[PDB]
């Protein structure tokens, strides 16, 4: 375990990550990603899409799979 998207995928396959926010200039960009798991929405933010997506998965894992080793 180490990659949030990878670990969540082990619990739920075919999840779709949606970019819901992209703001700030090329020097202060902020991305917000959202993932839906069991009708529940989880979001993650960051300076780039990859980490925003990872935080979105982490949020899902922290709620639904607390024991999953990071």
Curated annotation (Swiss-Prot):
Tissues in which the protein is found: Ubiquitous.
Post-translational modification: This phosphorylation results in the dissociation of ILF2 from the ILF2-ILF3 complex resulting in a cytoplasmic sequestration of ILF3 where it can bind to viral RNAs and impede viral replication. Methylated by protein arginine N-methyltransferase 1.
Post-translational modification Phosphothreonine, affected residues: 68
Role noted for this protein: RNA-binding protein that plays an essential role in the biogenesis of circular RNAs (circRNAs) which are produced by back-splicing circularization of pre-mRNAs. Within the nucleus, promotes circRNAs processing by stabilizing the regulatory elements residing in the flanking introns of the circularized exons. Plays thereby a role in the back-splicing of a subset of circRNAs. As a consequence, participates in a wide range of transcriptional and post-transcriptional processes. Binds to poly-U elements and AU-rich elements (AREs) in the 3'-UTR of target mRNAs. (Microbial infection) Plays a positive role in HIV-1 virus production by binding to and thereby stabilizing HIV-1 RNA, together with ILF3.
Lineage, opening ranks: Eukaryota, Metazoa, Chordata, Craniata, Vertebrata
DRBM domain segment(s): 1-66
Provenance organism: Homo sapiens
Residues of the full protein shown: 525 to 594 of 894
Subunit structure: Identified in a IGF2BP1-dependent mRNP granule complex containing untranslated mRNAs. Interacts with FUS and SMN. Interacts (via C-terminus) with PRMT1. Forms a complex with ILF2. Can also bind to PRKDC/XRCC7: this may stabilize the interaction of PRKDC/XRCC7 and the heterodimeric complex of XRCC6/KU70 and XRCC5/KU80. Forms a heteromeric complex with ZNF346 and ILF3. Found in a nuclear export complex with XPO5, ILF3, Ran and double-stranded RNA or double-stranded minihelix VA1 RNA. Found in a nuclear export complex with XPO5, RAN, ILF3, ZNF346 and double-stranded RNA.
Compartments (UniProt record): Nucleus, Nucleolus; Cytoplasm; Nucleus
Name recorded for this polypeptide: Interleukin enhancer-binding factor 3
């Amino acid at each position: 375990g180490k990659n949030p998207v990878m670990e969540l995928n082990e619990k739920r396959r075919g999840l779709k990550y949606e970019l819901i926010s992209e703001t700030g200039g090329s020097h202060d960009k902020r991305f917000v990603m959202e993932v839906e798991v069991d009708g529940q929405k989880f979001q993650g933010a960051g300076s780039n899409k990859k980490v925003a997506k990872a935080y979105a998965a982490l949020a899902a894992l922290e709620k639904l799979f607390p024991d999953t080793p990071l």
